Amino acid sequence: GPLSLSVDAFKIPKWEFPRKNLVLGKTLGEGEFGKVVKATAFHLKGRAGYTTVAVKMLKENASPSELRDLLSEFNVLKQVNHPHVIKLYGACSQDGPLLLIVEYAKYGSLRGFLRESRKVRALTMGDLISFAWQISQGMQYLAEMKLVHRDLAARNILVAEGRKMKISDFGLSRDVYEEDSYVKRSQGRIPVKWMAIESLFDHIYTTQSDVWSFGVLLWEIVTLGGNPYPGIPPERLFNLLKTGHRMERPDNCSEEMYRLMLQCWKQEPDKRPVFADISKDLEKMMVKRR
Amino acid sequence: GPLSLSVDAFKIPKWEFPRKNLVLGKTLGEGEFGKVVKATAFHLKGRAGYTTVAVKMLKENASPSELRDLLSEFNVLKQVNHPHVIKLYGACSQDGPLLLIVEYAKYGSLRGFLRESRKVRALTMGDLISFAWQISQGMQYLAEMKLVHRDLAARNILVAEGRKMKISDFGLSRDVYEEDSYVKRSQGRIPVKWMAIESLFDHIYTTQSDVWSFGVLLWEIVTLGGNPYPGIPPERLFNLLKTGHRMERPDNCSEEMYRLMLQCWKQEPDKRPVFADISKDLEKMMVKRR
Ligand SMILES: Cc1cc(C)c(/C=C2\C(=O)Nc3ccc(N)cc32)[nH]1
Ligand SMILES: Cc1cc(C)c(/C=C2\C(=O)Nc3ccc(N)cc32)[nH]1
Fold this sequence. Notes:
It is classed as transferase. Chain A is 35% helix and 21% strand.
């Protein structure tokens, strides 16, 4: 089938790293098919000595779907390069289990980073605007590469040295250089509360559904890692969404910031901002703060 | 899409239980889309007082796929009744999150039960044959109902009062009254090492792939909850399987028992035993022990 082909094609040098030069450590978390461990790599792509890295692999009892996801992620990260997208350094596929060797972000996930925080780790509204803008810049680059990410959320943004945002989890990203949409027949594996109305109902993903998700991520940013649609079960979302409802303005959120969220959630995808406008809007908010 | 229809159809009495008569407790485990909590139910279907039950629900950030899985499970368990299949008592779908109220098996999962054990909790080879036979009886009943289970494994068999086996996790089960196979286009979510060669390669599921899985479960039973194909990565399974290899005879395993395993793993599905023969074979082993 499609996977046996992918596994054989794959299994037969710029990305290949010797397993014996990688040392694995503690688990950092479980993703959308994968496990991420802290690791250290010896003589990694021209860096003399050990470099602290993160390693993505399969959990116990991995399914065909998870393995395809991991191979898919690996194939997207090869093509992708941007200071606000997680960096890929290699893979180990010859001696044992498939391991992806990626950039380590010192502060962990954005959700976790925000939930350890307060308002004024003491974070300003400028810091929160800054985070959202970096992410938006990363998204505009991916949108320019013709890639829908599909799984945009605070748990999938990492915080690197100097509080730099890194977009991660590319297991679910799709190529759209051709039809400008990715249409999935079976049911998706992206959390219900982060999905655009057309993705939920019609299984259509586009850069415009990434914008929807981004608007949900914005809400997470502004609430310091709050839980979207709190106390509302996912099954209620079909009806709540189609009848026009949206999360209300959260506390500690300017009128203009809430306007940007709502705009990302417009029912008609063509009336949502593109990432270039989002970056423009957030820039404009940053400079008027003073 | 297919799910919004299912969620609306569903959301609009023999199975409906009042939420206020259910009290939730500790988590028991995370399944193949779901969370299972221990619970207690007041005046549950004619039992006066509280009955200790188990409750299946969605985890945090549930996806469309998981929700469909939960609704699917609920729809299969309504039709299903057998002393060795987990019993469904109701659902709560009107006040909050979807909850399935199911039979509580006091000893937990079969894997966990076996891994706490030794050979002679001291278990004989008769006890292990007994477990496998009860499971096989459950499978023959489901096979007669025209249901492929797809996810047969020790972690999905529960151990109830009196060490009774209960087949669980019906999230992935399919109806095959019509074409006698279930064919999935996208990649499955069943662990690679429990899947028949045709399911892995050609995405075909039949009662004959359940037999394959059962043979893997047999190995788990005989090894007291060992890990299949130990130290072999899932990606190696395409090639290992198609070139004719199988797990070797484990220790503490008769010649005849190993013969039954191999037979479940025959490449050609029509040369595998049906569950009736498996039950016949295990019965025959039980009585010759003495
Ligand atoms: C200190 C730390 C905590 C965490 C959750 C991380 C996570 C990651 C990390 O540091 N690099 C990563 C690359 C991909 C994914 N999916 C996760 C990570 N690092
Ligand atoms: C004491 C105990 C431990 C465990 C893992 C259980 C698990 C279940 C249990 O007791 N009933 C269940 C029904 C369905 C599923 N998927 C799991 C269970 N019970």
